[PDB]
Amino acid sequence: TEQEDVLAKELEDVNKWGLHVFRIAELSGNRPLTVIMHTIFQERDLLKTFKIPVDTLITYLMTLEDHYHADVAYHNNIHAADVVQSTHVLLSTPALEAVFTDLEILAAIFASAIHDVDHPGVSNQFLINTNSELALMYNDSSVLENHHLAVGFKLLQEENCDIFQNLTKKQRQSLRKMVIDIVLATDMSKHMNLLADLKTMVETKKVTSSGVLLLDNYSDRIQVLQNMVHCADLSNPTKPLQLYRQWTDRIMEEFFRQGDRERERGMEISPMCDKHNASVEKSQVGFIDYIVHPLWETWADLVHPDAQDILDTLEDNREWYQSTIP
Amino acid sequence: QEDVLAKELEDVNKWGLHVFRIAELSGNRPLTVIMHTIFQERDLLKTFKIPVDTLITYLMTLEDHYHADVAYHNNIHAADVVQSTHVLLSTPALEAVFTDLEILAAIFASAIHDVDHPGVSNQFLINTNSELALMYNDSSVLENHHLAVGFKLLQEENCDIFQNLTKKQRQSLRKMVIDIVLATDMSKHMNLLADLKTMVETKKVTSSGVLLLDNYSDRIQVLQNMVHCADLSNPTKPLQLYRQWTDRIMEEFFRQGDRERERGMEISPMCDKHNASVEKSQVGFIDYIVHPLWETWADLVHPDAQDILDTLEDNREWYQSTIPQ
Numbered sequence: 236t237e238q239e240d241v242l243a244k245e246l247e248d249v250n251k252w253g254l255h256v257f258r259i260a261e262l263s264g265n266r267p268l269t270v271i272m273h274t275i276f277q278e279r280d281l282l283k284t285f286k287i288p289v290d291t292l293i294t295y296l297m298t299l300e301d302h303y304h305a306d307v308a309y310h311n312n313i314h315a316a317d318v319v320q321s322t323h324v325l326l327s328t329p330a331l332e333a334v335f336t337d338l339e340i341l342a343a344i345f346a347s348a349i350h351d352v353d354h355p356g357v358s359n360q361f362l363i364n365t366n367s368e369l370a371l372m373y374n375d376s377s378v379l380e381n382h383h384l385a386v387g388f389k390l391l392q393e394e395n396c397d398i399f400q401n402l403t404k405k406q407r408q409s410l411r412k413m414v415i416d417i418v419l420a421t422d423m424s425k426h427m428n429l430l431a432d433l434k435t436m437v438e439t440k441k442v443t444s445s446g447v448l449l450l451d452n453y454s455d456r457i458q459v460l461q462n463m464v465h466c467a468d469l470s471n472p473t474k475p476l477q478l479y480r481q482w483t484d485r486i487m488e489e490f491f492r493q494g495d496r497e498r499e500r501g502m503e504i505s506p507m508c509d510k511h512n513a514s515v516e517k518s519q520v521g522f523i524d525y526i527v528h529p530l531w532e533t534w535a536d537l538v539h540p541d542a543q544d545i546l547d548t549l550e551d552n553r554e555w556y557q558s559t560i561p
Numbered sequence: 562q563e564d565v566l567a568k569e570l571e572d573v574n575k576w577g578l579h580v581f582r583i584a585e586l587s588g589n590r591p592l593t594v595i596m597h598t599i600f601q602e603r604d605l606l607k608t609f610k611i612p613v614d615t616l617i618t619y620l621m622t623l624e625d626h627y628h629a630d631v632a633y634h635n636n637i638h639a640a641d642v643v644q645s646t647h648v649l650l651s652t653p654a655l656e657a658v659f660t661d662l663e664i665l666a667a668i669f670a671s672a673i674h675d676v677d678h679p680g681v682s683n684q685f686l687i688n689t690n691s692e693l694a695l696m697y698n699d700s701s702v703l704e705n706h707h708l709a710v711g712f713k714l715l716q717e718e719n720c721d722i723f724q725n726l727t728k729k730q731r732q733s734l735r736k737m738v739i740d741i742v743l744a745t746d747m748s749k750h751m752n753l754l755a756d757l758k759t760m761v762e763t764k765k766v767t768s769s770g771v772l773l774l775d776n777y778s779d780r781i782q783v784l785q786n787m788v789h790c791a792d793l794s795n796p797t798k799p800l801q802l803y804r805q806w807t808d809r810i811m812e813e814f815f816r817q818g819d820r821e822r823e824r825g826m827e828i829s830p831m832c833d834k835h836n837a838s839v840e841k842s843q844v845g846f847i848d849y850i851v852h853p854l855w856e857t858w859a860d861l862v863h864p865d866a867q868d869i870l871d872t873l874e875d876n877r878e879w880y881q882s883t884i885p886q
């Protein structure tokens with residue numbers, strides 16, 4: 236019961252950026268996604284609002300967590316838990332207070348939880364290039380993301396797993412559509428278009444008399460949620476360095492494993508997947524300069540000045556990785 | 562019977578082919594015989610080094626995956642769309658617009674475009690929480706499935722008709738076929754028509770009057786609208802054929818409508834047998850969907866789609882005449 240109290244102590248930081256998710260993973264017996272999701276649902280009073288039976292929630296979460304691969308270095312249950320918790324913090328930003336309904340909040344969090352379920356540890360391009368069964372099923376379009384959604388929803392049909400059993404038909408219909416729109420937007424090939432639209436929104440931003448963001452149509456509302464989860468998905472470089480470095484170690488291991496498979500297939504090794512010609516530090520600086528910072532700088536503007544500290548950490552981490560190059 | 566069949570196939574390059582007769586004369590193998598005839602007519606087996614036996618094996622396997630108990634979306638409809646696309650590709654206004662690979666893609670796409678169709682709509686599959694809708698996240702559910710089945714069948718014994726295409730050709734073919742079949746999703750009609758109109762008001766032609774499509778984006782857009790037009794070509798065919806197609810789609814619709822009623826669902830339009838107006842519906846279908854599309858296409862290849870647009874207007878007049886004052 237002592238380890239349980241230690242876990243509870245750690246979960247007290249659920250509303251903070253930089254929570255130590257790896258520690259929670261260890262303290263929870265490798266159930267970070269289940270405990271963090273359960274904690275967040277209680278924190279947001281979602282069980283009461285949507286009449287979700289506690290046993291049903293725990294059963295679904297354990298089943299969902301089970302469908303993430305424990306043998307994939309990065310795209311596993313810890314990453315899912317991290318994206319869920321990061322999205323949870325972003326949803327609480329002052330600039331968005333009272334903006335989203337409980338159903339939209341539920342959608343964003345659920346989407347985050349299932350967004351990478353059953354990820355094999357290889358990219359969409361690798362699956363397409365190897366004529367995989369998955370790419371055949373999904374016609375080379377958002378292959379993995381379509382699969383994550385299919386699995387996430389299908390698991391709700393398992394014994395005592397339908398956590399949405401008490402939502403109205405209309406609520407279920409709306410939630411399913413929002414979750415699909417959000418997870419499909421996590422396809423990295425859509426990053427540029429997603430960012431392009433986010434920039435357009437910031438340039439034409441409008442706030443209410445309360446000072447919060449004004450979103451009066453589905454298009455704008457779902458666009459903000461899509462970008463929110465995408466930011467959470469790309470939040471590793473914005474976290475305290477000891478967390479960021481572990482995430483980098485994990486994605487590189489995953490990349491190298493894919494590279495070994497590509498080499499063993501006589502295929503041209505994907506970028507940053509060749510362990511015999513890798514520049515980890517220079518690659519992280521590039522990742523931040525061309526993808527992560529442009530995105531976070533834009534999000535920071537949308538919710539200014541709410542994300543200033545997050546942006547400052549990202550810039551400090553960029554500076555640090557750069558310093559390891561000279 | 563083979564002499565009669567071979568005789569009917571002589572009009573494979575004509576709009577209004579007796580596809581139903583061909584189905585009956587071929588032992589219900591319209592898709593196989595029509596596809597085979599077209600590949601030869603266009604000399605595609607030689608161009609892409611496709612083994613004759615491999616072509617036959619695949620075609621039969623493919624045709625076997627169309628449901629014989631589905632009134633409209635079966636192998637006869639597939640055969641009809643293939644043949645219709647085959648004719649549209651010969652439009653003089655498009656004589657030197659598409660490459661052989663693009664021609665191959667449009668034809669193959671037409672053949673597999675409705676494979677394994679269950680006889681119910683995407684909306685029905687979505688509202689009933691079907692396995693198919695769950696798999697495809699309510700997006701172009703059937704069309705994604707037709708493609709998946711179409712390509713998967715190539716993996717069956719002696720069924721890879723693209724075995725001799727280069728790596729780049731296969732990759733390009735797959736992309737175009739996917740782009741074309743996904744465009745047959747009826748919910749994308751308005752968007753596809755819009756793009757078609759834009760290409761018309763910004764069209765460029767040559768001396769012979771042939772269309773000039775430089776960008777792949779515009780080319781695939783034409784092929785998408787082409788196969789879409791073929792998919793919606795029933796009302797532009799001789800009346801005897803059109804009426805048979807109408808009987809079939811209505812039978813399929815009514816069978817679905819009953820299911821929507823047996824389950825307390827909002828019966829989809831024109832799916833209520835106890836409350837339907839076949840004739841008024843066809844006129845509406847022509848006025849709001851088919852004519853707008855074919856009129857726009859007619860302008861694109863102006864004026865080579867005049868005989869087709871004429872038959873459509875004649876059929877529209879006949880159906881209207883069957884409606885009492």
Ligand SMILES: O=C(O)c1ccc(-c2cc3cccnc3c(-c3cccc([N+](=O)[O-])c3)n2)cc1
Binds near residue numbers: 358482
């Ligand atoms: O295909 C996908 O869905 C996918 C691919 C890559 C990443 C990813 C995650 C990272 C996390 C932490 C540090 N780096 C990560 C990188 C990454 C690493 C090195 C270089 C680059 N880059 O973009 O140049 C990116 N990529 C996520 C998702």
Ligand SMILES: O=C(O)c1ccc(-c2cc3cccnc3c(-c3cccc([N+](=O)[O-])c3)n2)cc1
Binds near residue numbers: 682683747807845850
């Ligand atoms: O969901 C789909 O993929 C789908 C749905 C309907 C049709 C279709 C085919 C017709 C063929 C011949 C005459 N009519 C057809 C109609 C149709 C019939 C009556 C009215 C209408 N309409 O749109 O009003 C359409 N619909 C095809 C495909």
Ligand SMILES: [Mg+2]
Binds near residue numbers: 350422
């Ligand atoms: Mg992902």
Ligand SMILES: [Mg+2]
Binds near residue numbers: 674675703745746
């Ligand atoms: Mg179809």
Ligand SMILES: [Zn+2]
Binds near residue numbers: 314350351468
């Ligand atoms: Zn992810």
Ligand SMILES: [Zn+2]
Binds near residue numbers: 638
């Ligand atoms: Zn069709």
